[PDB]
Every structure is written in C-alpha cells, then in structure tokens.
C-alpha cells in the first residue's frame, strides 16, 4: 500500500463554512447570510457570522497546514465578498484577502485549488431570481473570468462548481439549504443553469489561456438495490440517475439521462433550454472532482416521489454522527464506474471524510480513532482503484478544520483540526491530523 510519489494529498474547506467576517470590509450579503438569519432554518440558531474566523486567522491556519504536510489546499472563493452585488463593483479588500491567502500558500509550498462556487450566491442576485434566472449564469461566467485573470500564473487547479445536485435539490426542491425554495420544477431549472454556467466558465478558461487545469466537482452516491426484485433494481437505478447521471451525462455525453429526462418531462413539463446549451455544458474539461461519503441502499415502496423509491436505513452497519453508513467499497465502485462509463480524464477525490463525536481533552488532545479508521479504510479503496487502472491523481480530506456544517450548524465536526469556538477560536490538531501527516510522508497506509 504505497501511493504514487506525486499523488496530491490535500484537505478542503469552503468560504461560508470557515471565513466569518460576514459583513466586513465591503462584503455583500449572501443567500446563506439571509438563510441562517431566518428563524427555524439552522440547528440551535447557529450562523456563519463568525464561524472559524478564517478571514482573520488565515496565517495561523496555513502554519497548521504546514504541520499536517498537505500538498494541496482546496478552498472556495466568496462571490459576494468579491462582487458585493454579484455584478457591478469589485470589492478590492475582498479580492485582497484571497491574494494574501494565495501568496501565503505558495510561500509554504502548498498548491492551491480554487472552487469558484461553493453555494454562497450573492443575495442581490437571488432577489432577481438567482439560479432560475439565466443571467445568473452569465454573471457567474464574468466572475470566473475576473478570478482567472487575477490568479493567472498563481493558481493552476480550478473547480467551477461544488455539488450542483445539492445546490439544485436541497436549496430549491426540499428547502433545506439556502435559498430555501421547495419546488421540484424550480430545482430542475436551477440544475440546468448551474451546468450552463459551468460550460460558460470553461470556455472562458480556454480563451484566457491560463496555465493549469479546470474541472467540476460532483457529489456521487452509488445506489444498491435492497434485493433481487426488479422493482428494487429499477428503483435503485432511478435514484442513482437522479443524483449521478443527471450531472455526469450532460458534462461528459452532452445529454441528460434519457429515461429520467422522459419521466420528468412527462410528469412535470419541460424546463427551459436554448439550442446549443448541451454543447456548452459538455465542453471538454481537464479533470473530474468526485465527492464521496456513503452509498444508498434502495427498495421499491409507495412514496410521494416519481420513482417510488425508498432509501433503506442500514441499522446493522457502522455509521457516522450524520447517520451515514460507512461503506468504503462504494468509493471504489464509483471511481471504476466513472472511468468505464463516462470519462478517461484524470480524477480527483475532491472530498471525503466523516463526522464523529469529537471530545477535546483539557490538554487539547482529540483522540479521533474512528476518523482514522474511516479515512484509512477509504484510502485503501482509492489504492485499489489505482491498482486497477483508474487515473486517480489526488485525494482531499473534508475537512481541514471543524466548521459551520450548513443546516446542522456547529454540531457536526468533520475536521482534521478541532476548532474551539467558545475559547478564542483556538485550533487543536486532532490525532487524525498527525496520522495523516505520516500517511503523506511515507506515501503508505
Ligand atoms: O449535503 C449533505 C450533508 O453534507 C454534510 S458534509 C458536506 C460539506 O459540508 C460540503 O461543504 C461538501 O461539499 O459536501 C459535503 C456533502 O454534501 C453537511 O455538513 C450537511 O449539512 C449536509 O446536509
Ligand atoms: Cs414513457
């Protein structure tokens, strides 16, 4: 179990989850500022107002990155911190923060990967319809161009979008995430525009002629039927397409998955598209980022979804604090499936990790054995994928540090680093952090 010498071992975060400084130095309001300040939306009424205060503490966080020995740091940039209204004026202090951050990363020999959109849409753009407005895709493209030009020669790994499935469906169908809408047709229109905006950014990446590589990051959850019933098998297949193929087929094949597209259209009516959209959505990219956490086991059951599909709770199997099944085999399955059915391009696991009930000792120790076991077990499946020909180039752990976990607030801890919010926001390396350092150095698990 030795990994390639040049394998990119990293850790990942996102802007709203760690930065804080929510209305400081010219920053505009995001849909997540608004959502978290709306009653009943976040566990315990938590907000990302301060979070980990990374906006002020970034220099200390980079020292901690150095202690862990990560080769690359994946982070997202806040669109409303840079263009407060989404379009219009640039906020120079906002841009300046990311410039300092990138400079500091490069001086520590840490390779930056930027995610352009990790869910924090400017509220001014939401007031004009947000992702159901085709113009939002244009403004995203303009924001991308601004960042490409600013970091030309400085950042060589770029991700347009993080988890467009979640943005579309949790944000607009089920209303669990900002902006809180609950309309399945809206979600489908939003998915289309996220994909369009991705392709528009790729076109701009090519034109600007930056050194480096661009991709998109998709959450992928492989589905398994509960039993050999073909109704079970069909239901699993449909749920699987609903999360996975719905984004993988347009990016790589230039079409929505046919059976699912037909079912949506017949029952809901068509969402609005223009001729040529699929050509834009399917522009050639340099890599695919995969975010993996768990699988779903699926059976056929009466439900208020078009699939009559139920996700089965696997009560008999180890799970995390999220209640998610621990199923490392799924990581192998999904990497192999992508490489066979969709693309021969390089792959990166841009997220994988776990929440456990972390206990900070009086001396600042966190003995997170369960996270070490979780990470090592998934590392081994990644190795197995490499052994079998999958061009896996790197692996970023979610997350570098504990943070604002959206609707769960601070109650869920995914970090390699413990953040003691109550006591000056001090950081403590968990045992998994020093265990990870050993993995990176030896290239072995
Ligand atoms: O979306 C499901 C569930 O995910 C967890 S973890 C989450 C990270 O917070 C997000 O930044 C990353 O890109 O994706 C993973 C999976 O979506 C999140 O804490 C929780 O609120 C959310 O409901
Ligand atoms: Cs049909």
Author numbering: 4 to 448
Show the paper's wording.
In HoBGLA, however, the TCB molecules folds into an unusual conformation to place the reducing end O1 atom within short hydrogen-bonding distance of the catalytic nucleophile Glu354 Oε2 atom. Considering the overall similarity of the active site in HoBGLA and PpBGLB, the striking difference in TCB binding was unexpected. The corresponding loop in HoBGLA is considerably shorter (residues 303–308), which provides more space in this region of the cleft. Consequently, the PEG molecule is allowed to bind differently in +4 than the corresponding glucosyl unit in cellopentaose bound to BGlu1. We predict that an oligosaccharide longer than four sugar units, i.e., binding beyond subsite +3, could be bound to HoBGLA either as observed for the cellopentaose in BGlu1, or possibly, as observed for PEG in the TCB complex.
In this work, a BGL from the thermophilic and halophilic bacterium Halothermothrix orenii, HoBGLA, was characterized biochemically and structurally. It is an unspecific β-glucosidase with mixed activities for different substrates and prominent activity with various galactosidases such as lactose. The overall structure of the 451-residue large HoBGLA displays the typical (β/α)8 TIM-barrel fold adopted by retaining GH1 enzymes.
